Design a protein around this ligand. Structure first.
Ligand SMILES: [Cl-]
Ligand SMILES: [Cl-]
Length: 341
């Protein structure tokens, strides 16, 4: 396991870094003041801008999901905005995100400074992968569903979520990186799939010889990833190939007894740097699992963690995750040599 990214250690006493608050904003959908982050602040994307770490967290009201913004000098202290930055609005995407909102963002940045967010649009009928862009991280422009166009709209009503764009470390920053002249992402919840794109907006799911969605990995009985194998933060190139950090949901009946039933633990998949569909290695045991009190609650007695943000900052990697389906926590890795390529 020389290729594994880590270890990620929880800084003592700092977690959780983002918790719910009764903060209000005027909702253009509900046309009234809404306590948009009163219930939970979790499943966070993370990125960097102007030397600062930015965490874009899923927030739920009393539900509708909206994305909040938090800014941090050191990756620990958070300065939050009173208004959410991505939410259902009076726009041309009501069919996609009214009334369930915008969930579970993952963010990556192009070398030219465009931040691309892959998130889930929820209309209470289908949860569907959507794309938003921004240059300042506060003003987001929706571009619709990731699979709206591809193959005569074949997957325009496919239930799907969790998009992890391929990135690499370039001169002090994680940037989006291409594969064979096209942009690339892993995606999925019940299996890990892939998709390509010319423009980061319209994505084309990779199909196999049977003209079916090609699964790279899927759940395994007896292991932590026994019910789901869900994309975590953006994938990252390393000396040994492409590493995808992913979240496994454990079955209490057919999973790994060493971990809690129905909880998520994090694994890693090593794929070939020349052939991103080719698996080279996969962790048998999770590299990050619920262990601390802040990752547990009444609903998740033994805890649960969901990894969704990964940033390189001052020669360290900061991992941001949803803890107990309700708060945001951070863990840090100071071993980054493997990222130089
Ligand atoms: Cl730890
Ligand atoms: Cl598999």
């Amino acid at each position: 396991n020389n290729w594994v990214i880590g270890p990620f250690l929880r800084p003592e006493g700092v977690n959780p870094v983002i918790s719910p608050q009764p903060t209000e904003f005027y909702c253009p959908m509900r046309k009234q003041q809404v306590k948009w982050e009163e219930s939970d602040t979790f499943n966070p994307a993370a990125t960097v801008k102007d030397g600062k770490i930015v965490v874009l967290y899923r927030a739920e009201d009393n539900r509708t999901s909206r994305v909040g913004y938090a800014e941090s000098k050191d990756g620990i202290e958070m300065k939050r905005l009173d208004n959410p930055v991505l939410f259902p609005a009076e726009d041309n995407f009501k069919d996609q995100d009214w009334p369930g909102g915008c969930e579970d963002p993952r963010v990556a940045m192009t070398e030219d400074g465009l931040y691309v967010m892959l998130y889930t649009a929820w209309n209470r009928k289908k949860a569907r992968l959507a794309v938003a862009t921004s240059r300042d991280l506060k003003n987001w422009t929706k571009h619709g569903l990731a699979f709206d166009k591809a193959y005569n709209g074949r997957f325009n009503n496919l239930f799907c979520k969790s998009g992890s764009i391929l990135t690499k470390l370039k001169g002090n920053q994680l940037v989006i990186d291409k594969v064979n002249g096209k942009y690339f992402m892993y995606w999925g919840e019940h299996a890990i799939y892939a998709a390509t794109s010319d423009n980061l907006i319209d994505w084309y799911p990779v199909l196999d010889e049977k003209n079916e969605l090609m699964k790279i990995i899927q759940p395994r009985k007896g292991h932590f990833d026994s019910l789901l194998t869900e994309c975590g933060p953006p994938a990252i190139r390393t000396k040994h190939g492409i590493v995808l950090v992913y979240n496994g949901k454990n079955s209490g009946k057919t999973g790994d007894a060493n971990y809690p039933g129905n909880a998520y633990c994090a694994g890693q998949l090593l794929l070939d740097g020349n052939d991103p569909y080719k698996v080279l290695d996969r962790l048998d045991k999770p590299f990050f699992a619920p262990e601390a009190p802040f990752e547990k609650s009444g609903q998740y007695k033994d805890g649960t963690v969901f990894i969704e943000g990964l940033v390189y900052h001052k020669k360290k990697l900061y991992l941001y995750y949803g803890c107990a389906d309700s708060q945001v926590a951070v863990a840090v890795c100071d071993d980054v040599k493997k990222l130089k390529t």
